[PDB]
Amino acid sequence: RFLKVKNWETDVVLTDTLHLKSTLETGCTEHICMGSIMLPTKDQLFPLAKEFLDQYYSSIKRFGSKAHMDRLEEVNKEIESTSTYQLKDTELIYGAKHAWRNASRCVGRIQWSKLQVFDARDCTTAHGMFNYICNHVKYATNKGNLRSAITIFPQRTDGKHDFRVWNSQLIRYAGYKQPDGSTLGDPANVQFTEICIQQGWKAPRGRFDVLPLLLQANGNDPELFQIPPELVLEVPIRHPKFDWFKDLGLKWYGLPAVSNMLLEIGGLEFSACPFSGWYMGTEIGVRDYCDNSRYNILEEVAKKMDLDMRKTSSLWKDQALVEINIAVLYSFQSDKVTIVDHHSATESFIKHMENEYRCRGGCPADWVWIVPPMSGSITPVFHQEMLNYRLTPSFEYQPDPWNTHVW
Amino acid sequence: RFLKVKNWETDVVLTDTLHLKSTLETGCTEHICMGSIMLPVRTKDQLFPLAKEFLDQYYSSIKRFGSKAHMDRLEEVNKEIESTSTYQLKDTELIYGAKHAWRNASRCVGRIQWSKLQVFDARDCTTAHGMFNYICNHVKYATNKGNLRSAITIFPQRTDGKHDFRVWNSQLIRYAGYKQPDGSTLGDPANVQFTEICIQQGWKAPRGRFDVLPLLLQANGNDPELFQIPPELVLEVPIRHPKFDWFKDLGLKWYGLPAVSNMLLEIGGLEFSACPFSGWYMGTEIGVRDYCDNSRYNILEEVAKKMDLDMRKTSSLWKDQALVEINIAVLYSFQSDKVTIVDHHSATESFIKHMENEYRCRGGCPADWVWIVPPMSGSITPVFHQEMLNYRLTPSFEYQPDPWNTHVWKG
Numbered sequence A: 001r002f003l004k005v006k007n008w009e010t011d012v013v014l015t016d017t018l019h020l021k022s023t024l025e026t027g028c029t030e031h032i033c034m035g036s037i038m039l040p041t042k043d044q045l046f047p048l049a050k051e052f053l054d055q056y057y058s059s060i061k062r063f064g065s066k067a068h069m070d071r072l073e074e075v076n077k078e079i080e081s082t083s084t085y086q087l088k089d090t091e092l093i094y095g096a097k098h099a100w101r102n103a104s105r106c107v108g109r110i111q112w113s114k115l116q117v118f119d120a121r122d123c124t125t126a127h128g129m130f131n132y133i134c135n136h137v138k139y140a141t142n143k144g145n146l147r148s149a150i151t152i153f154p155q156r157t158d159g160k161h162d163f164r165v166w167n168s169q170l171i172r173y174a175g176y177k178q179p180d181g182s183t184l185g186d187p188a189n190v191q192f193t194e195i196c197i198q199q200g201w202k203a204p205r206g207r208f209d210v211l212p213l214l215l216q217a218n219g220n221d222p223e224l225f226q227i228p229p230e231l232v233l234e235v236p237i238r239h240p241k242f243d244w245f246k247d248l249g250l251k252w253y254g255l256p257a258v259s260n261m262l263l264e265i266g267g268l269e270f271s272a273c274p275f276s277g278w279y280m281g282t283e284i285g286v287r288d289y290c291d292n293s294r295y296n297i298l299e300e301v302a303k304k305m306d307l308d309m310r311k312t313s314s315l316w317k318d319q320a321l322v323e324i325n326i327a328v329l330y331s332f333q334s335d336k337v338t339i340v341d342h343h344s345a346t347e348s349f350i351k352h353m354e355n356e357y358r359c360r361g362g363c364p365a366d367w368v369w370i371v372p373p374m375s376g377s378i379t380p381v382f383h384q385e386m387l388n389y390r391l392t393p394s395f396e397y398q399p400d401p402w403n404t405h406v407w
Numbered sequence B: 001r002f003l004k005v006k007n008w009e010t011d012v013v014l015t016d017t018l019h020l021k022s023t024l025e026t027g028c029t030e031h032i033c034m035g036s037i038m039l040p041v042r043t044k045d046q047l048f049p050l051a052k053e054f055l056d057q058y059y060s061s062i063k064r065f066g067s068k069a070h071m072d073r074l075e076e077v078n079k080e081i082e083s084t085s086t087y088q089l090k091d092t093e094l095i096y097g098a099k100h101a102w103r104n105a106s107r108c109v110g111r112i113q114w115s116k117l118q119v120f121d122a123r124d125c126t127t128a129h130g131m132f133n134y135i136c137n138h139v140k141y142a143t144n145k146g147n148l149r150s151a152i153t154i155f156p157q158r159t160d161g162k163h164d165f166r167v168w169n170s171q172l173i174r175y176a177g178y179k180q181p182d183g184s185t186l187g188d189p190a191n192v193q194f195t196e197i198c199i200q201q202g203w204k205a206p207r208g209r210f211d212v213l214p215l216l217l218q219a220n221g222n223d224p225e226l227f228q229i230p231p232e233l234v235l236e237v238p239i240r241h242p243k244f245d246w247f248k249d250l251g252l253k254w255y256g257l258p259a260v261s262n263m264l265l266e267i268g269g270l271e272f273s274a275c276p277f278s279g280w281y282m283g284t285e286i287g288v289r290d291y292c293d294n295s296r297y298n299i300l301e302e303v304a305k306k307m308d309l310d311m312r313k314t315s316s317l318w319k320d321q322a323l324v325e326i327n328i329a330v331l332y333s334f335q336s337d338k339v340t341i342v343d344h345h346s347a348t349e350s351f352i353k354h355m356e357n358e359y360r361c362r363g364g365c366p367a368d369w370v371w372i373v374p375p376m377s378g379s380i381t382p383v384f385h386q387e388m389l390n391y392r393l394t395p396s397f398e399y400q401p402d403p404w405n406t407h408v409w410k411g
């Protein structure tokens, strides 16, 4: 029932009780651990609503008050009558912040209570969606002083009138298959790029082309819009010691904005809920630049550094990796665009875990995602035991719309 | 039922059926995953089923399932259990069992090598001096003057739990740690408590930064006895860097033979509480963990000082820079002295090939991602991108409590 987690570097032990409140399932069983797998009615809704309102009223220290009991009755009445219900602004803000608080894969949660929530439930068209999104982008970017934000579109109804952003992130680069057999741009986005073309986008067919938005309102066919270029803050990548680095022609965008997830609050489903914070440097320099299935630039960089690439044991990949990551952080810092390094980010997360343990009784965390993709054991999270479990409100994965949409 | 795992770099999808043979539990439930938790006498009643599954497995491995020889062995084991409360493994079954415990070790990246294990049968051992002799022979054989060979030595199994064979050392070869009155540590901080025990047992400590610890050996539930491994049997490597000439003056060395001595081997219900085993190092074990953990030798600052990196801000990645240089040094030093070592790129690439071959031939390969992914440069190794299923197969290696916590002192 009560569970201990130990830090093997500091010997600090913490007791988790919060997991007992957990509801959804992990994918694991007593016989098999699925810890490293990427993706493991009216009757249904009222318990979900109650569970949520109970935690909301508890949080404002008004549990079992007249105002508490009155809202539960009102929501039950609305469900019985409409088969759904509407959240108060206060409940929406609370729910969104707590979905982030509960995000077991997010290292940046120390920030969870400073989220600017943009209520877009009055939106009816793709043009309106585009307007809301440009405003989100400009607010969050803040000329490089980035601010966390989420924009929340109308909830699911009968399931044939879904709002969706087809893009995986608001800002991403195009990918094109070449007659060469190679890939131009970002190979992760080839399929989405093709969907854009088949829908009518004229592509510049370059290495770093900001994709258009493909927005779906009210279960209608999705529509294309180019984000005003002046709202997309980008960063040229240079190195503080290697003058040749700029010749590689690398750039990245300042605003990481996940747009393909589903926000669940009190049983209600927000299928369009783009949200954004700011980058941890490794996301760009380790993953986006060095994954073999991504920009895969390790080979080119190592060559310019004149390292011995004859044998893996020279650690040439490891040397180049570090340099690429130094350059990303240096470039963002020099252009005054918010970025956090993996040492600072994991250090703050340890402090956050301890806050959550004493103030809340625990913190769900997925070690496989929390530990940075480079220099794992020299960050304090490596040595920290974590318990992973699913609390609601939550951000969830959902299938890509092109597999699902009825045209 | 079939379970699928995907590699997100290659899109290669594999199907696991082997998990259906898993009996032991994980620590996880449908409501909690304990995937990152480090540590999450039998009755005749429980013993014969365990013996039976094992012998059915052994007899299938040799293509003799249901044979007269298989059936006669079952009956023989059965009768021996009801008569004596336990049983003895044939040499062939012992070898198969020890190899399979390695094959089944989900935290081990080196498993491509599982079928090449030299098994030394030490079940006729009776005394601590006997144990010492067996362990010296293991060390000499495994070391092989730098050309390391995997080996395990197997002492007599548990009987009533009052007559246990134990090696009190956590590894056969490790360096002493000494806590000083000013709170600093001399040597390896991981071994402070064990060093304190050795000293109290009468070990005369040299008190340097790399003093090889004595063996503390318990035979037959008796109080443990101290022994010094002959220095000439302990192969060591001075650490230097290919381009940095000041690196040698750090005064660093490490031993060549990594030999875990504190685990328990379970085969067919039988418990071998002293079963030291050894392979060879992956460089990051020494360069990342042993040298750079804050709770170990903690050399990152001193190395980064000497390199003249910008140390005032973590975002210069000074720690990451120093980390790579140290790890280059460890591999360079071992290679130069012709002592077996494997880099983390080579080892992970070989593990993926092993894992795929195991899916094809065995129907699965239990693997613990948290342990398999190296402690530096995670995502530039292929294992990071590989989904894995963790489950527990027998024969297996298991943790057991440290013996100073459980031993009944005789005096």
Ligand code: HEM
Binding pocket: A100, A103, A105, A106, A107, A108, A109, A111, A115, A148, A149, A150, A275, A276, A277, A278, A279, A280, A283, A340, A345, A369, A395
């Ligand atoms: C403010 C600074 C933030 C930092 C430094 C940060 C850090 C990170 C990192 C490094 C990841 C792993 C991403 C990957 O590997 O693809 C992540 C994932 C995630 N973050 Fe955060 N984050 C921040 C803000 C936010 C916000 C504002 C939200 C929601 C309101 C959020 C929710 C999530 C979720 C749900 C995931 C998992 C996404 C997935 O499974 O792909 N984060 N975060």
Ligand code: HEM
Binding pocket: B098, B102, B105, B107, B108, B109, B110, B111, B113, B117, B150, B151, B152, B277, B278, B279, B280, B281, B282, B285, B342, B347, B371, B397
């Ligand atoms: C042949 C070369 C081998 C290599 C390169 C290798 C590599 C490794 C590494 C890097 C680890 C993680 C160690 C740590 O972080 O402390 C490990 C763990 C382990 N290995 Fe291997 N290994 C080898 C041979 C063996 C052998 C011969 C056995 C037994 C017969 C074995 C069984 C295990 C077990 C049980 C663990 C988990 C240890 C624990 O939980 O503390 N390995 N191996």
Ligand SMILES: CC(C)SCCC(=N)NCCC[C@H](N)C(=O)O
Binding pocket: A106, A256, A257, A258, A275, A276, A277, A278, A279, A280, A283, A284, A287, A288
């Ligand atoms: C938006 C939430 C998921 S986390 C806040 C932003 C962020 N730090 N990253 C988002 C993921 C970006 C991706 N890894 C990339 O490298 O492009």
Ligand SMILES: CC(C)SCCC(=N)NCCC[C@H](N)C(=O)O
Binding pocket: B110, B258, B259, B260, B277, B278, B279, B280, B281, B282, B285, B286, B289, B290
């Ligand atoms: C003996 C099995 C567990 S694996 C075969 C040897 C090995 N490669 N490592 C053993 C652990 C060494 C420890 N990490 C150290 O850094 O001293």
Ligand SMILES: C[C@H](O)[C@H](O)[C@H]1CNc2nc(N)[nH]c(=O)c2N1
Binding pocket: A036, A037, A038, A368, A369, A370, B008, B384, B385, B386, B387, B388
């Ligand atoms: C197979 C494995 O689960 C997968 O590669 C994971 C590992 N850890 C990760 N960690 C983060 N933060 N982001 C990721 O995309 C991944 N990928």
Ligand SMILES: C[C@H](O)[C@H](O)[C@H]1CNc2nc(N)[nH]c(=O)c2N1
Binding pocket: A008, A382, A383, A384, A385, A386, B036, B037, B038, B370, B371, B372
């Ligand atoms: C808490 C966490 O599980 C612990 O630090 C683990 C992480 N992964 C590891 N992986 C290996 N190979 N060896 C280790 O000691 C550890 N330590």
Ligand SMILES: [Zn+2]
Binding pocket: A028, A029, A032, A033, A034, A035, B028, B032, B033, B034, B035
């Ligand atoms: Zn699990």
